[PDB]
A paper describes a structure:
The crystal structure of CrTRXf2 was solved at 2.01 Å resolution. The overall structure is a flattened spheroid of 49 Å equatorial diameter and 25 Å polar diameter, and conforms to the classical TRX fold. In CrTRXf2, the first active site Cys (hereafter referred to as CysN) is located at position 38 at the N-terminal kinked tip of α-helix 2. In the CrTRXf2 structure, the catalytic Cys are covalently disulfide-bonded in accordance with the non-reducing conditions of the purification and crystallization procedures. Trp37, Gly39, Pro40, and Lys42 of the conserved 37WCGPCK42 motif arch over the disulfide bond, leaving two gates to interact with the solvent. The third cysteine of CrTRXf2, located at position 65, is perfectly conserved amongst f-type TRXs and was shown to be modified by S-glutathionylation. In our structure, Cys65 is likely in the thiol form, since its side chain points inward to a hydrophobic pocket formed by Phe33, Val63 and Ile78. These specific structural features of CrTRXf2 should guide the recognition of specific targets by facilitating target space accommodation, flexibility, and electrostatic interactions.
The redox activity of TRXs is guaranteed by the presence of a solvent-exposed motif (most commonly Trp-Cys-Gly-Pro-Cys) containing two cysteine (Cys) residues that catalyze protein disulfide reduction. Here, we describe the novel crystal structure of chloroplastic TRX f2 (CrTRXf2), and a crystal structure of TRX h1 (CrTRXh1) from Chlamydomonas reinhardtii.
Numbering used by the authors: 72 to 179
Write the structure that this text describes.
C-alpha cells in the first residue's frame, strides 16, 4: 500500500524528499476510477523503487490541502521535485501516468 499523506504531513514529506521524484495520487472515497487504478499503482511503486509513490485522501479533514492544491478531478496525479510540482494529470489513465513519469524520471 502507498504511503498516505495528510494536510499536516504533505509539505513536510516533500520538504525532506530532496529532489527524488514524488508521485501523488489524490483520491476520494467516492471515486470509482481510483479503485480501478490502485492495484496498478501499487504494482508500479514496487517496480519503480527510485520514485516515491504516495496518496492523499481529499476529504473534509484535508479540505484545506485540497483547496490549496486546487484539486478538481478524482483521481488527480501530481509529480513533485524539490517541493515543486513538475507535472500533473487527471483521471485513471495509467498509460498516460507511466509516460508522464518516464518523461521526468526515465528508468535505469
Amino acid at each position: 500500500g502507498l504511503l498516505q499523506l495528510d494536510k499536516d504531513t504533505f509539505w513536510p514529506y516533500l520538504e525532506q524528499q530532496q529532489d527524488t521524484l514524488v508521485v501523488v495520487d489524490f483520491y476520494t472515497d467516492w471515486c470509482g476510477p481510483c479503485k480501478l487504478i490502485y492495484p496498478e499503482l501499487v504494482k508500479l511503486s514496487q517496480e519503480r523503487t527510485d520514485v516515491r509513490f504516495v496518496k492523499v485522501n481529499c476529504n473534509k479533514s484535508n479540505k484545506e490541502l485540497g483547496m490549496q492544491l486546487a484539486i478538481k478531478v478524482a483521481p488527480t496525479f501530481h509529480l513533485y521535485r524539490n517541493k515543486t510540482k513538475v507535472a500533473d494529470m487527471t483521471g485513471a489513465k495509467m498509460d498516460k501516468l507511466i509516460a508522464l513519469i518516464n518523461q521526468h524520471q526515465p528508468p535505469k
